[PDB]
Amino acid sequence: GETRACGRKLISLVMAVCGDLCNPQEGKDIATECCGNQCSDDYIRSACCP
């Protein structure tokens, strides 16, 4: 079935918070804590516009 979704989940959940407005620049790290541990709107800022 579906595979893992974390780095994608970081840009996925923000795609609804940023709406392709900010930028998921280098998402191979911030998603290291949101894959299933720490997350938050503030964390999104550094994932969409750090």
What does the alpha-carbon distance between residue 2 and residue 46 come to, in Å, rounded to a whole number? 27
3-state secondary structure 11-31: HHHHHHHCCCCCCCCCCCCHH
Nearest Cα neighbor of 14 from 3, 1, 2, 30 is 30
Give Dmax over CA atoms of the chain in angstroms: 33
The whole-angstrom separation of Cα 24 and Cα 18 is 9
Checking the chain for breaks where C and the next N are over 2.5 Å apart, the residues before them are none
How is residue 11 written in tokens? 């840009």
Tell me, rounded to whole angstroms, the distance of Cα 21 from its chain centroid.
13
Enumerate domains of the chain plus CATH numbers.
Answer: 1-50 (1.10.100.10)
d(CA 25, CA 2): 25
| Determination approach | NMR
